């Protein structure tokens, strides 16, 4: 059952831009994201912390918000111009989705924004205006040995990947890689607007749930340093999977778990997908190299755990099996 | 400044720089540099022409080496977004009064319908959409060399009037990610992009038209260091012109080397995302030395005096305006 | 514990582990793994034997691959400080009542006067001083592979009685850089060195004598990652047994892979200096999981069950004591 | 004119171990060594700072001492046992050199020591006893992106290299590499006791002067980070030479200058020299690759500037041309 294709154009989406995460103990979460991982504080107060990666100039890539139930409040995408916020609102209203528009934004440093409960149950935000901050690209005096340099993508778990895929294609995302069986059925898909492998990916499973949010480092040694530092801090039990090389995406990856169990991917090595006819790489569902190029052992929790997502009232979306 | 007119018709929708056609005087000696020393991958070749691509490329080639009498650059080729944009490119340059030549079957093997033009700054530009796809070698780690060149990134052009050049490329849709200006606001150099990296081409002020360099990226810094180590072992370190260093403008960890005819190749790593619509332009002052070298590396005079000739559409060098 | 007697004569002055002689069942298939996949350099070879060395080696070889009926290790060879120390080695092991064999012209090509012994733990040990020097390829960056193995570092042996083994190697002059003990002080494993790195050999408790692995170093971490990437591209990733990971004991960034006969090769990088006379021994508790994996990587069962047979001086396998 | 070979044995030297440097403004020097370079403070007071590298367990690798004239007070070598301190004293006394023995040491954390004005005018110290401190090898929580992991060597400028070479050979050092002309005359030599390329090197020139003291990093990217951080701190004019690859030693190198002009080499990649017949690599004096494998331009100051050294009274040794 495909989502209908609207008669109005999709909003012109530039890239994933930030995620709003609800955490149960802000101070313990700050230790993880700032003291362990080195993300940069744009600004913070007692209940909210705004973080950005090294090469970011928009206000933030992560908003950590204290709350009663750990969950993801919003997956935010930046659109190309103010008119595209109006386009986003019109598109989701034609789809019959719940929408909420706030001229002054939902998170600090972001202006006119529309949030929607999308067709797959996810809270998506579209915005254009954002407060610019000092871009720390060349602030090597602040560079840590495990520096996270850029926000790259989201990964969502949903029960019907083919439905999800066609919905995101209509939204303008293109598939750089997918996993299919012999009958041509899509089991997972990596989808992009910007010129990397993906801005989001759809993973088959119980959902809506947030599988992970991902940041890139400049080189492989930076990822190894994150592992080494976690070992020295005696929190290696928070390293869930990796380091490894994924066949799909070609990423050298690491998955770690924050204090509430939210999964963060840190990776490096991506490749250019910007040409109009970029060739889709289709992996067979039985090729193990799709998961691990090197054959690394399977970690069960990577296939069972994922974060709840919220609706526009701040309540968890029930997870459908 | 005599600015190039802004045409009444839309600029072609340019996706990225895509390849350069370089004329070399001794093809076998050039093949030893680009293939045996640098490891670029041969798409196909014959007695007079070699088609090369980088590791992560799927279009037919990123460099064409063509045997010829005078070392020079025959074409700077950009890939456009659809077949219709080749028609748009031809109409745009015809309105500007520039010489154009259209070939439905292409000018280089593996490329289809193309238009070449002698642009307003005297450079041979090509716009094409169609290209033969080849095996994308991204995950062919069995072919991966210690100094592997993974992607073609950009061109760098020398022209006498940078303000004229900048406004012409802005009209063509390129945006400025970084520039060098004086206190009065005059542009001395500019880095301009269509794809989401620092640049697809840059303008350097000087006698021109000339080609300053063509650049490839590696995955990491150690790959660049290995190119220098290998050139030292082969006793060709005198072909290392400048670097390794870190440029303040672009933030690139760079290396400039010279091919057998003196054509300059940049190998670099580290770039950053410029795809947002309001990406902030970084303006460097003309007197900030760190714009050239973040670490203060000594100036190499040839980098400011030598650059390659470019050809007109008849295959003859364009005169250098001094 | 039945300790090996401490001889009345001095132990031979051992400089470092130097090479291992490995018997393989299909020499051509083994050559494809060690030379085509791993890039080790061929010193010389013939139809039945291949002599290999790492990039920075100047002695004749670090590995000898010998075709034979049963895959096993024929010798663990250590280089001693002078010709006189070969005489010292022979006298030491004869006093211990061990079988010895002395060959003035060596047991493997490129090695001179050597003594081999069936040591107190059942292992075939060789001590030699003289070796043919070959081109040290340290700066041959034109031959440098992306996953280059630069140096032979150590052996790792499985034996049933680690306390007996440790005291025997201490008497031979090896010092313990790190060990694993329980609250009672019993040694479960020990890393022992003569040269100034963490170890030349290590003792692992288990059925033995068996050879757990032989290890080579790379210059940097990315070189190890490239070995895994290349094995993935060649569709031989099932020969990657364990890693990459960081061991707490030794601090090594490691990778264990398996040759065609199942012999285990460690490739690692990062070691530290142990040459001071009072270098502090790091004792890890048997229940500290980080001793095995600093990052907590999952346990690979085969790493604790599989290890290679070793041969006696007649070329027959030494029985495994269980 | 060779230094005579003593009838008593040379002290059994293990490795170079630390350098005592006099600086004119301790606070400005602390900013360089600790805040810029990340060396670890063992202990410090108002007039002296004791620093060590990441993998060191002896008390220190550098002692920074406030004083009126920037200079090097001592090049210290660790010997193999307490008896070797007696051996060192006997050896230099037979050579007619000035000696001073202090059972309680010259610098904190070092025990019984003998200092000597050696035959080439350098202040050398030999000691065995030292206070052990926490070895920070696995303290990845303290690891900086440009971490200096080990002290490797000293490099001295002296007018007569052949005299210097034979003197250090008699002392037990072996030559791993040298630079000679066609007649076989030694112009420079790299000499070692431990199993790396060198513990000291002799450079021909006006002396006695200290050319540089060197620390290793784990990998090349750590050296590039030091350069990047110095650029961000707008102190790139303190980067004197590099990064480059030396042909002699095969080191990937960087030379920087502290606040008083003292030269510090940071490098990586060395190779094993421990076998008894390790082959000496002799470079011709006209092979430019001996200096720079890549051909990097010559930096004049690297051949003209070097630090004064002190005598046992704390006064500068006059520099002989
Ligand atoms: Mn991901
Ligand atoms: Mn460039
Ligand atoms: Mn091992
Ligand atoms: Mn040095």
PDB file of C-alpha atoms and ligand atoms in Angstrom, chain C residues 154-156 191 199 202 213-215 247 256 266 268 303, ligand 3:
ATOM      1  CA  UNK C 154      57.347 -12.413  17.971  1.00  0.00           C
ATOM      2  CA  UNK C 155      56.169 -15.984  18.435  1.00  0.00           C
ATOM      3  CA  UNK C 156      53.313 -17.146  20.698  1.00  0.00           C
ATOM      4  CA  UNK C 191      54.952 -11.975  27.437  1.00  0.00           C
ATOM      5  CA  UNK C 199      57.969  -9.635  23.468  1.00  0.00           C
ATOM      6  CA  UNK C 202      54.719 -15.395  24.792  1.00  0.00           C
ATOM      7  CA  UNK C 213      50.835 -17.517  16.077  1.00  0.00           C
ATOM      8  CA  UNK C 214      53.746 -15.651  14.463  1.00  0.00           C
ATOM      9  CA  UNK C 215      53.503 -11.850  14.308  1.00  0.00           C
ATOM     10  CA  UNK C 247      44.619  -5.956  23.237  1.00  0.00           C
ATOM     11  CA  UNK C 256      44.720 -12.450  13.332  1.00  0.00           C
ATOM     12  CA  UNK C 266      49.145 -11.855  13.731  1.00  0.00           C
ATOM     13  CA  UNK C 268      49.734  -5.617  14.535  1.00  0.00           C
ATOM     14  CA  UNK C 303      41.459 -18.430  18.922  1.00  0.00           C
TER      15      UNK C 303
HETATM   16 MN1  LIG E   3      50.806 -11.914  19.462  1.00  0.00          MN
END
